[model samples]
Structures are given as structure tokens and as C-alpha cells.
Target: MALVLVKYGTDHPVEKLKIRSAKAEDKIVLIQNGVFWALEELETPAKVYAIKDDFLARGYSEEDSKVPLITYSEFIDLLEGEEKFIG
Candidate 1:
């Protein structure tokens, strides 16, 4: 099975559409670009992440997603072997 990581860096409603679509795919590993609204729409594994510190520096926080936190290493793991789907 392939892993699809949907990275959410921006807080665009259209990007949410992509994540929603990914959730329905056969093989997907959803990863958020930051602790933005993407978290609100998903749970761990269902949606995982390693948000940018710069983004966090801009006031982003862990108060967004309903999922567990994913560090850089874990995030890298997800990217392995699987095809990445970005938006």
C-alpha cells in the first residue's frame, strides 16, 4: 500500500478538501503543514504532522488538531517509500 501525506501549511478551506479526499483514499498518510485547522478535522494517523517552527513562531500552536503530535523524525518516516501528495 502507498502512503499519502497531505501537508497543510496554509489555512485554506480548499486544502481541507484535499485532506478530506485523502482520508477516503486506499493508501494515505496525512501530515499537517502546521498546527492549523487541519487538526480540527482529523485524528492521529488519520492525520499526522510536523508543523514548521517558523509557522509556530507566527503564533501557531498545538491547540488545533484532534490528533497526536508527530515529530520531524516520525514525519520523515512517513515520507519513505510512499508517494507524497502535496497541495
Candidate 2:
């Protein structure tokens, strides 16, 4: 499975839509300003996760995200399962 990292929302018009290119086996990680995407309904096959600190720092709590909240360490563990990394 591939890993998709959403870094910043404002910079990439292409990549935000590119998230749909992912398959069911893919994983999406929301970071930086990307955490805001969690509040929106994303249509994608990929599983989603958000960094706990990233969301909270941006005034979002676990209640605000549609995906699971993960630790940096948990995010590291996910790397081992990745077949490719998508920015």
C-alpha cells in the first residue's frame, strides 16, 4: 500500500485533488495545514489518519477529524508498511 502525505492545503491545487488517485490499500496522513481537510468530507478510497498534535495546534480536536488520530511514533510505524510515499 502507498502512503499519501498532505502537507499544506494552500500550496497545492493539484495534489489535493490528487488524493483521489489513491486506492483502497493506500493510506493518507494529514499534516500541517492539511489537518483542515479532516473537517471536510473527502471522497477517497485511502484510509485516513491525522497527527494529534497537528490538529490540536490548529484549534482542532479529535472530534473535528473524520479520521483516526495518531502519534508521531505511530506514524513512523506506518512507514514500514508503505510501498510508496506520495507527497
Candidate 3:
């Protein structure tokens, strides 16, 4: 299992490659400015989660279906089970 932390949005070309490298069963969490990626439709195979506080702060509602909203506490829990992490 991998915990992929995306701190940068789609504007960064490297982000696309990073996401492309993600394999199945990996948990991809968008944090800080990374939440922007979730606002748009992305072709990622991994399960994507966005920080609820960051998404709401950016004027996005939790009703968005593009990505699931997760709390900071939940993010920590995700880290606990991952054998590898990429950011």
C-alpha cells in the first residue's frame, strides 16, 4: 500500500506524472493547494481523497462527486496502514 500526498495541483506538469505512477489500492490525498486537482475531473486509478477543510475554504462544497472529502484526522489514519508514501 502507498500513501501518495499531493501538495501541488494540476498546474505543475510533474504532478501528472506523479499521479500516473500511482498503482492500484494506493491512497491519494490532496492537501493544501493540491485540492485544486480534485475540483476538476482527473484520470487517476487510485482512490482520491481531498482535505475537507481546504476544499471548503476554497469555496467548494462537500457535495462534489469528483473526489471524496476527508478530515485531517482521517488523513492521519490513512498514513498508519501505508507501507510506502510518495509526495
Q: Please list the C-alpha lDDT of all candidates, in the order they appear.
A: 0.42, 0.63, 0.64
Displacement of the residue 57 alpha carbon in candidate 1, Å? 2.3
Clashes by residue pair, model 2: none
Kindly list the per-residue Cα lDDT of model 2 for residues 1-87, writing each as its tens digit. 333455675332123553645566756566778776666644556666778888888887788777788876777776776645533
Candidate No. with top TM-score = 2
Candidate 2 segments exceeding 4 Å error: 1-5, 10-20, 81-83
**In model 3, what is the error at residue 66, expressed in angstroms?**
0.7
Q: Say which prediction, candidate 1 or candidate 2, comes out ahead on TM-score.
A: 2
Higher-lDDT candidate among 1 and 3?
3
* Clashing residue pairs, backbone N/CA/C < 3 A, model 1: 4-29, 8-33, 39-65
| lDDT-based ranking | 3, 2, 1
What alpha-carbon RMSD in Å does predicted model 1 have with respect to the real structure? 5.7
The residue-level lDDT of candidate 3 at 34 comes to 75
What ordering of candidates by TM-score runs from best to worst?
Answer: 2, 3, 1
Off by over 4 Å in 3: 1-5, 11-15, 81-87
